[PDB]
Scaffold this motif. Structure first.
Motif, PDB file in Angstrom:
ATOM      1  N   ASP A 105       0.954  -1.438   0.175  1.00  0.00           N
ATOM      2  CA  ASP A 105      -0.289  -0.370   0.387  1.00  0.00           C
ATOM      3  C   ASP A 105       1.052   0.898   0.144  1.00  0.00           C
ATOM      4  OD1 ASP A 105       0.622   0.691   2.696  1.00  0.00           O
ATOM      5  OD2 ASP A 105      -1.757   0.165   3.519  1.00  0.00           O
ATOM      6  N   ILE A 106       0.679   2.352  -0.121  1.00  0.00           N
ATOM      7  CA  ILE A 106       0.756   3.707  -0.326  1.00  0.00           C
ATOM      8  C   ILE A 106       1.763   4.497   1.608  1.00  0.00           C
ATOM      9  CG2 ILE A 106       0.738   5.943  -0.825  1.00  0.00           C
ATOM     10  CD1 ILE A 106      -1.397   5.086  -2.561  1.00  0.00           C
ATOM     11  N   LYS A 107       2.996   4.440   0.933  1.00  0.00           N
ATOM     12  CA  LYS A 107       3.379   4.391   2.200  1.00  0.00           C
ATOM     13  C   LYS A 107       3.264   6.478   2.994  1.00  0.00           C
ATOM     14  CE  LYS A 107       8.208   5.369   2.809  1.00  0.00           C
ATOM     15  NZ  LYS A 107       9.354   5.618   3.892  1.00  0.00           N
ATOM     16  N   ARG A 108       2.550   6.628   4.198  1.00  0.00           N
ATOM     17  CA  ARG A 108       2.490   7.845   4.569  1.00  0.00           C
ATOM     18  C   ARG A 108       2.907   7.406   6.095  1.00  0.00           C
ATOM     19  NH1 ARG A 108      -1.998  10.548   6.662  1.00  0.00           N
ATOM     20  NH2 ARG A 108      -0.724  10.685   8.878  1.00  0.00           N
ATOM     21  N   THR A 109       3.291   8.448   7.027  1.00  0.00           N
ATOM     22  CA  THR A 109       3.301   8.560   8.583  1.00  0.00           C
ATOM     23  C   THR A 109       2.229   7.803   9.064  1.00  0.00           C
ATOM     24  OG1 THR A 109       2.431  10.646   8.757  1.00  0.00           O
ATOM     25  CG2 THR A 109       5.035  10.896   8.040  1.00  0.00           C
ATOM     26  N   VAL A 110       2.595   7.192   9.899  1.00  0.00           N
ATOM     27  CA  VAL A 110       1.975   6.240  11.002  1.00  0.00           C
ATOM     28  C   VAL A 110       0.910   7.661  11.749  1.00  0.00           C
ATOM     29  CG1 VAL A 110       2.522   4.703  13.277  1.00  0.00           C
ATOM     30  CG2 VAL A 110       3.629   4.441  11.204  1.00  0.00           C
ATOM     31  N   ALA A 111       0.149   7.012  11.483  1.00  0.00           N
ATOM     32  CA  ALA A 111      -1.554   8.089  12.098  1.00  0.00           C
ATOM     33  C   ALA A 111      -2.227   7.018  13.092  1.00  0.00           C
ATOM     34  CB  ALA A 111      -2.220   8.318  11.231  1.00  0.00           C
ATOM     35  N   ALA A 112      -2.499   6.745  14.676  1.00  0.00           N
ATOM     36  CA  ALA A 112      -2.795   6.626  15.529  1.00  0.00           C
ATOM     37  C   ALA A 112      -4.879   6.436  14.976  1.00  0.00           C
ATOM     38  CB  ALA A 112      -2.614   6.831  16.899  1.00  0.00           C
ATOM     39  N   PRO A 113      -5.736   5.992  15.567  1.00  0.00           N
ATOM     40  CA  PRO A 113      -6.728   5.397  15.153  1.00  0.00           C
ATOM     41  C   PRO A 113      -7.652   6.936  16.044  1.00  0.00           C
ATOM     42  CG  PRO A 113      -7.307   3.851  15.989  1.00  0.00           C
ATOM     43  CD  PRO A 113      -4.934   4.344  15.713  1.00  0.00           C
ATOM     44  N   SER A 114      -8.419   7.491  16.009  1.00  0.00           N
ATOM     45  CA  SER A 114      -9.446   8.508  16.573  1.00  0.00           C
ATOM     46  C   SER A 114     -10.064   7.271  16.726  1.00  0.00           C
ATOM     47  CB  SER A 114      -9.987   9.728  15.768  1.00  0.00           C
ATOM     48  OG  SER A 114      -8.768  10.250  16.094  1.00  0.00           O
ATOM     49  N   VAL A 115     -10.685   7.473  18.061  1.00  0.00           N
ATOM     50  CA  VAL A 115     -11.369   6.590  18.509  1.00  0.00           C
ATOM     51  C   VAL A 115     -12.453   6.512  18.763  1.00  0.00           C
ATOM     52  CG1 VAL A 115     -11.906   4.074  19.502  1.00  0.00           C
ATOM     53  CG2 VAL A 115      -9.936   4.404  18.919  1.00  0.00           C
ATOM     54  N   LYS A 188     -29.190  -6.121  31.398  1.00  0.00           N
ATOM     55  CA  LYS A 188     -27.420  -6.547  32.096  1.00  0.00           C
ATOM     56  C   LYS A 188     -26.523  -5.981  32.628  1.00  0.00           C
ATOM     57  CE  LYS A 188     -30.449 -10.640  32.099  1.00  0.00           C
ATOM     58  NZ  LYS A 188     -31.022 -11.560  30.738  1.00  0.00           N
ATOM     59  N   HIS A 189     -25.380  -5.208  31.814  1.00  0.00           N
ATOM     60  CA  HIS A 189     -24.376  -5.155  31.906  1.00  0.00           C
ATOM     61  C   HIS A 189     -24.490  -3.048  32.617  1.00  0.00           C
ATOM     62  CE1 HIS A 189     -23.334  -8.558  31.212  1.00  0.00           C
ATOM     63  NE2 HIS A 189     -23.858  -9.134  30.716  1.00  0.00           N
ATOM     64  N   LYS A 190     -23.369  -2.790  31.906  1.00  0.00           N
ATOM     65  CA  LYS A 190     -23.042  -1.487  33.352  1.00  0.00           C
ATOM     66  C   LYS A 190     -22.232  -1.358  31.847  1.00  0.00           C
ATOM     67  CE  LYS A 190     -24.936   1.983  34.844  1.00  0.00           C
ATOM     68  NZ  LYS A 190     -24.406   3.557  34.704  1.00  0.00           N
ATOM     69  N   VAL A 191     -20.854  -1.755  32.100  1.00  0.00           N
ATOM     70  CA  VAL A 191     -19.414  -0.683  30.735  1.00  0.00           C
ATOM     71  C   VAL A 191     -19.444  -1.387  29.610  1.00  0.00           C
ATOM     72  CG1 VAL A 191     -17.214   0.210  31.380  1.00  0.00           C
ATOM     73  CG2 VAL A 191     -18.492  -0.346  33.238  1.00  0.00           C
ATOM     74  N   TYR A 192     -19.017  -0.462  29.083  1.00  0.00           N
ATOM     75  CA  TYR A 192     -19.035  -1.384  27.809  1.00  0.00           C
ATOM     76  C   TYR A 192     -17.836  -0.391  27.120  1.00  0.00           C
ATOM     77  CZ  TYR A 192     -23.812  -2.911  27.427  1.00  0.00           C
ATOM     78  OH  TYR A 192     -24.408  -4.071  28.227  1.00  0.00           O
ATOM     79  N   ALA A 193     -16.449  -1.182  26.455  1.00  0.00           N
ATOM     80  CA  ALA A 193     -15.889  -0.547  26.168  1.00  0.00           C
ATOM     81  C   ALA A 193     -15.162  -1.271  25.018  1.00  0.00           C
ATOM     82  CB  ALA A 193     -14.367  -0.685  27.113  1.00  0.00           C
ATOM     83  N   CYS A 194     -13.868  -0.341  24.720  1.00  0.00           N
ATOM     84  CA  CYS A 194     -14.055  -0.409  23.099  1.00  0.00           C
ATOM     85  C   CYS A 194     -12.041  -0.456  22.933  1.00  0.00           C
ATOM     86  CB  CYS A 194     -14.282   0.437  22.070  1.00  0.00           C
ATOM     87  SG  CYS A 194     -13.744  -0.348  20.165  1.00  0.00           S
ATOM     88  N   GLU A 195     -11.132  -1.358  23.324  1.00  0.00           N
ATOM     89  CA  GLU A 195      -9.860  -1.308  23.301  1.00  0.00           C
ATOM     90  C   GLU A 195      -9.533  -1.164  21.726  1.00  0.00           C
ATOM     91  OE1 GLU A 195      -7.371  -4.573  25.155  1.00  0.00           O
ATOM     92  OE2 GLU A 195      -7.333  -3.425  26.913  1.00  0.00           O
ATOM     93  N   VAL A 196      -8.316  -0.641  22.111  1.00  0.00           N
ATOM     94  CA  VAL A 196      -7.990  -0.677  20.333  1.00  0.00           C
ATOM     95  C   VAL A 196      -6.004  -0.044  20.491  1.00  0.00           C
ATOM     96  CG1 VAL A 196      -7.088   0.714  18.107  1.00  0.00           C
ATOM     97  CG2 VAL A 196      -9.663   0.526  19.265  1.00  0.00           C
ATOM     98  N   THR A 197      -5.454  -1.309  19.838  1.00  0.00           N
ATOM     99  CA  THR A 197      -4.266  -1.941  19.345  1.00  0.00           C
ATOM    100  C   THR A 197      -3.604  -1.561  18.392  1.00  0.00           C
ATOM    101  OG1 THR A 197      -4.136  -3.393  21.095  1.00  0.00           O
ATOM    102  CG2 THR A 197      -2.412  -2.935  20.575  1.00  0.00           C
ATOM    103  N   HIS A 198      -2.713  -0.647  18.522  1.00  0.00           N
ATOM    104  CA  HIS A 198      -1.737  -0.332  16.596  1.00  0.00           C
ATOM    105  C   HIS A 198      -1.215   0.541  16.970  1.00  0.00           C
ATOM    106  CE1 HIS A 198      -1.854   2.868  13.312  1.00  0.00           C
ATOM    107  NE2 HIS A 198      -2.403   1.931  12.681  1.00  0.00           N
ATOM    108  N   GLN A 199      -0.094   0.737  15.981  1.00  0.00           N
ATOM    109  CA  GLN A 199       0.921   1.473  15.980  1.00  0.00           C
ATOM    110  C   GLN A 199       1.128   2.465  16.528  1.00  0.00           C
ATOM    111  OE1 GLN A 199       5.456   1.646  13.450  1.00  0.00           O
ATOM    112  NE2 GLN A 199       4.001   0.345  12.250  1.00  0.00           N
ATOM    113  N   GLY A 200       0.435   3.271  16.022  1.00  0.00           N
ATOM    114  CA  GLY A 200       0.065   4.555  16.311  1.00  0.00           C
ATOM    115  C   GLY A 200      -0.386   5.623  17.693  1.00  0.00           C
ATOM    116  N   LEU A 201      -0.421   4.384  18.715  1.00  0.00           N
ATOM    117  CA  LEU A 201      -0.463   4.212  19.744  1.00  0.00           C
ATOM    118  C   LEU A 201       0.581   3.533  21.239  1.00  0.00           C
ATOM    119  CD1 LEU A 201      -4.512   3.238  19.925  1.00  0.00           C
ATOM    120  CD2 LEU A 201      -3.991   5.707  20.345  1.00  0.00           C
ATOM    121  N   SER A 202       0.467   4.370  21.652  1.00  0.00           N
ATOM    122  CA  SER A 202       2.045   3.724  22.828  1.00  0.00           C
ATOM    123  C   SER A 202       1.449   2.454  23.479  1.00  0.00           C
ATOM    124  CB  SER A 202       2.624   4.934  23.423  1.00  0.00           C
ATOM    125  OG  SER A 202       1.540   5.696  23.845  1.00  0.00           O
ATOM    126  N   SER A 203       0.798   2.639  23.707  1.00  0.00           N
ATOM    127  CA  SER A 203      -0.093   1.415  24.795  1.00  0.00           C
ATOM    128  C   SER A 203      -1.442   1.583  23.864  1.00  0.00           C
ATOM    129  CB  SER A 203       0.087   1.552  27.092  1.00  0.00           C
ATOM    130  OG  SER A 203      -0.862   2.807  26.881  1.00  0.00           O
TER     131      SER A 203
END
Lengths: 214, 213
Positions: A105-115, A188-203
């Motif tokens: 694919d076409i190279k650009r700088t690493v861009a972290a997802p906006s979640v 039945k549940h309270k906390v709904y979470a989306c956890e994202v791992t990507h090169q653009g994120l340090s953790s």
């Protein structure tokens, strides 16, 4: 049968770069290795057969080498036309088996997802169903992991992902992950979470909401 | 020149049958082994079946044995795949291919979609926001493809991402369309997704309002 594994899953390239893709066999296939190119919405096209031989009409910027269990495809001076998925394929034994592919694919700088996390609408909840959507927007490279958590329980088997093709203006990707629950389970549940791992994120980044809360 | 032209396929119910065809030109059809290869949505390539030049030798993948039958008519330069007892997992683009040492000529691909659905228009739900804000529309539970989404009747294109539809286990499609916008605009500009599902004549315009809850 013979498992074919390609590396890396994606290569970032610029016009004029030399690109090298790797294919590995789980056992010896001698010279019986072919390489194919696939573009979005189109059938595959043969590039190279028997490891090193160019098919009729294929440009001479493509070369292959290797034997046994190790093979490579080189593109020596990438042109716009070469941004594509590339597959290897073993013809040593039946069943013929393909690698899982490498996207050049076409190279650009690493861009972290906006979640962004989106609760189910009250409209939808009326109908007995709850869709929770996690947006990963304008990221690069394409490899990204989305883990759903509900009251901290790791979800599997009840989400679906969809990804865009690389954007023509900014060279990024976007991805939707959608979690589907019955209204009963949602209640039945309270906390709904989306956890994202990507090169653009340090953790990994967690976006979350609490059901019913403002 | 050398060409493989596919036909057949399309919509089928689980348990049902379809026959695919492949018409060859530009080479000596009767002197080549022919094959079928499939590709599930968003996935890689899987070989399905081969047949030798004169139909003496027939090969099948583990996953289709006993349901799919490959055949050919050399006098009509044609390759066939009779697919029976179709399941959701057989949803894929199917290609015919000639083999020499590698798969050297491929058909254009034929989409097979296995679903029990009848024609049905989508429900459209807001994906509501709360420097840059993201908003969208979830277009859920429609059949068949396609739906179109625009924003603000085509005047908003920058930052729009409409995702590829996914076939759900219900046999109905779903997708989301999103747009990112400056949060400062959320209090003054209206953002509306325009959804059209022409097979059901279902048109919806949904203004997506910022929420806090």
């Amino acid at each position: 049968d013979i498992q074919m594994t390609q590396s890396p899953s994606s290569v970032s390239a610029s016009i004029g770069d030399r690109v090298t893709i790797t294919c590995r066999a789980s056992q010896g296939i001698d010279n019986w290795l072919g390489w194919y190119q696939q573009k979005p919405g189109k059938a595959p096209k043969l590039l190279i057969y028997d490891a090193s031989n160019l098919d009729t009409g294929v440009p001479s910027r493509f070369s292959g080498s290797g034997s046994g269990t190790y093979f490579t495809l080189t593109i020596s001076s990438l042109q716009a036309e070469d941004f594509a998925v590339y597959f290897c394929q073993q013809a040593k034994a039946f069943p013929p088996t393909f690698g899982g592919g490498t996207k050049v694919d076409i190279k650009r700088t690493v861009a972290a997802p906006s979640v962004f996390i989106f609760p189910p609408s009250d409209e939808q909840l009326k109908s007995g169903t709850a869709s929770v959507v996690c947006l990963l927007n304008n990221f690069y490279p394409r490899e990204a992991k989305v883990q759903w958590k509900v009251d901290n329980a790791l979800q599997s088997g009840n989400s679906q992902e969809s990804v865009t093709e690389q954007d023509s203006k900014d060279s990024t990707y976007s991805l939707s992950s959608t979690l589907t629950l019955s209204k009963a389970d949602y209640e039945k549940h309270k906390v709904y979470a989306c956890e994202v791992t990507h090169q653009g994120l340090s953790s990994p980044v967690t976006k979350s909401f609490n059901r019913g809360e403002c | 020149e050398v060409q493989l032209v596919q036909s057949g396929g399309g919509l089928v119910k689980p348990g049902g049958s379809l026959r695919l065809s492949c018409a060859a030109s530009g080479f000596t059809f009767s002197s080549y082994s022919m094959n079928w290869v499939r590709q599930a949505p968003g996935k890689g390539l899987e070989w399905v079946s081969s047949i030798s030049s004169s139909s003496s030798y027939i090969y099948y993948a583990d996953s289709v044995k006993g349901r799919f039958t490959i055949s050919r008519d050399n006098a009509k330069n044609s390759l066939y795949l009779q697919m029976n007892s179709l399941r959701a997992e057989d949803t894929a683009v199917y290609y015919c291919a000639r083999v020499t040492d590698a798969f050297d000529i491929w058909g254009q691909g034929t989409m097979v979609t296995v679903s029990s659905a009848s024609t049905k228009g989508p429900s459209v739900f807001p994906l509501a926001p709360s420097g840059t804000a993201a908003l969208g529309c979830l277009v859920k539970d429609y059949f068949p493809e396609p739906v179109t989404v625009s924003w603000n009747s085509g005047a908003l294109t920058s930052g729009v991402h409409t995702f590829p539809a996914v076939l759900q286990s219900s046999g109905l499609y779903s997708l989301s369309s999103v747009v990112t916008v400056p949060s400062s605009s959320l209090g003054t500009q209206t953002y509306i997704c325009n959804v059209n599902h022409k097979p059901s004549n279902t048109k919806v315009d949904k203004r997506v309002e910022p929420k806090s809850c």
